[PDB]
Amino acid sequence: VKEKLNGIIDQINKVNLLLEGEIEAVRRIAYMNQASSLQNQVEIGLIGEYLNISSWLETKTLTKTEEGLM
Amino acid sequence: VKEKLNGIIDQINKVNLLLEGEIEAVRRIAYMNQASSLQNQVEIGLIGEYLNISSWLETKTLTKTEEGLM
Amino acid sequence: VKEKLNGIIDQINKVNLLLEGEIEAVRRIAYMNQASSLQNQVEIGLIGEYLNISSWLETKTLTKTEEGLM
């Protein structure tokens, strides 16, 4: 009785710990990716300004991207 | 008896809700990152075409990236 | 008795499987995003070198990005 319930509680704790650990690992990556994609957007944006093509590059960019996303 | 099992069921529900909530939050970010990285790839691609260096920029890009990834 | 506990164990397994499946799906995306953002950083970096503006583009990039991130 007591040991079946204690066995069950232990599996609940293992599931909680294992999955929370995987999630935290995936979170760390996703936060890193968010920062990299912001950095890349900034840098691309600067190059666009340097070349003085910002406005047309942007419209072409937004429509092709929306097309790629469907 | 009934209350030990009910206590257990309640912890299973809390684990389910909490983790599902974290996952959904991480999912939202990852989908945002996917859209940003597509947009950035498009824009970089357009700049490459504007500068008329697309083919050589691409080969240099793919090999350095594969190297960075090992 | 036996069937309440067996019912409980079954829900623990469903929670484990379902959430692990969502996590693995989100992981796959995050690993894809990491590779795309590296590729984009490389390509942006190459364009910068081609234009011979690498150093100034970088400083402008890092500070605007840090500003965007607060």
Ligand SMILES: CN(C)c1ccc2nc3ccc(N(C)C)cc3[s+]c2c1
């Ligand atoms: C080799 N170096 C230093 C550079 C520097 C700036 C440049 N800007 C451009 C702007 C437009 C363009 N078109 C063909 C539209 C071609 C180029 S090529 C180019 C090469």
Ligand SMILES: [Cl-]
């Ligand atoms: Cl991500």
Ligand SMILES: [Cl-]
């Ligand atoms: Cl990116």
